[PDB]
């Protein structure tokens, strides 16, 4: 599946999208630190053993 | 016993940024003692006020550049980061700037508090080159002691900031550059005793008679955990 | 095979820190090895420290 840039990412607190527009990219100007996530990209997620 | 004890006897001011202080009677060796006391104590250890925060309409971060502003943003902020403001009440101080035309910006530009005292009024902190161009800025001062990079300030705070919400290191210390030396005082039936001459160059926002008085203060209070804790 | 490509572009204010290289004009380089505090260093009669 083609993968799509959107700010709805599974397991991620909202504290972490705080600094990314509704279209998944972190503001112009947004003071952001080590670790943070600067475009939310979502990959489908093939078959997985349980 | 034979002791003596230094009194504060003269207070030459130079002009509004140099001083020089007099302390006398001192006896044998006491001079470079509390000489080099006083200065390890006012250089490092003095409160000031020193802008910490700026907001400007229309600028989201510090690399950016406005119309007609002739300088970029972060010459504005390092022009900021040498404002001598001193304030009495208070010690937090929001204050603000609004300014339209051509010509030179200063510290006399600022909307005066009446609790806020800018010392130096014409040391300009921006220039506009279209007669349209308008700049509107909010200063936020606290008051301080020591350095503080940029880095503890966001470490400590833990609430969002609005983007737009630039951050200057601030340096609360108002004491530039201090010097002593010691000469012989004049005492009558003493002629052994010692005169402690200090020189403190700094910015406004503090009077030196009342820095000294801290400091004396401070080296007390210090001392206080060896006068009688052992 | 891409779809989108986003740049974000990211500005480092860096200061100075003990372990950078300090070098001259003359072939004498060096590192920094300790910050000092302004009044722990050697001053002059008139008080200027180096």
Not at chain 2, 69 to 92: P, T
Not at chain 2, 137 to 146: D, F, T
Not at chain 2, 154 to 180: F, K, M, Q, T, W
Not at chain 3, 1 to 29: F, S
């Amino acid at each position: 599946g083609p993968e799509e840039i959107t700010a709805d990412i599974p397991n991620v607190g909202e504290a972490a999208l705080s600094k990314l527009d509704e279209s998944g990219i972190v503001y112009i100007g947004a003071e952001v630190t080590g670790g943070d996530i600067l475009v939310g990209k979502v990959t489908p997620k093939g078959e997985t053993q349980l | 016993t034979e002791f003596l004890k230094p009194r504060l006897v003269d207070i030459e001011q130079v002009s509004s940024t140099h001083a020089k202080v007099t302390l006398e009677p001192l006896e044998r060796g006491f001079g470079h003692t509390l000489g080099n006391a006083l200065r390890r104590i006012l250089l490092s250890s003095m409160p000031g006020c020193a802008v910490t925060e700026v907001e400007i309409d229309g600028v989201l971060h510090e690399y950016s550049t406005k119309e007609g502003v002739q300088e970029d943003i972060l010459e504005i902020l390092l022009n900021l980061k040498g404002l001598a403001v001193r304030v009495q009440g208070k010690d937090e101080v929001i204050l603000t700037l609004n300014k339209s035309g051509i010509g030179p910006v200063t510290a006399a530009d600022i909307t005066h508090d009446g609790d806020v005292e800018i010392v130096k009024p014409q040391h300009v902190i921006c220039h506009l080159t279209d007669e349209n161009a308008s700049i509107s800025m909010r200063i936020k001062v606290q008051r301080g002691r020591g350095y503080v990079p940029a880095s503890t300030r966001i470490h400590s705070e833990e609430d969002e900031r609005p983007i737009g919400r630039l951050l200057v290191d601030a340096c609360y210390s108002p004491v530039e550059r201090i010097a002593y030396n010691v000469e012989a005082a004049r005492v009558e039936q003493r002629t052994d005793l010692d005169k402690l001459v200090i020189e403190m160059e700094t910015n406004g926002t503090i009077d030196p008679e009342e820095a000294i008085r801290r400091a004396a203060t401070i080296l007390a209070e210090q001392l206080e955990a060896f006068v009688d804790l052992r | 095979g891409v779809l989108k490509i986003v740049k974000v572009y990211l500005a480092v204010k860096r200061r100075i820190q003990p372990g950078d290289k300090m070098a001259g004009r003359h072939g004498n380089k060096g590192v920094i090895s300790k910050i000092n505090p302004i009044e722990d260093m050697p001053y002059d009669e008139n008080g200027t420290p180096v």
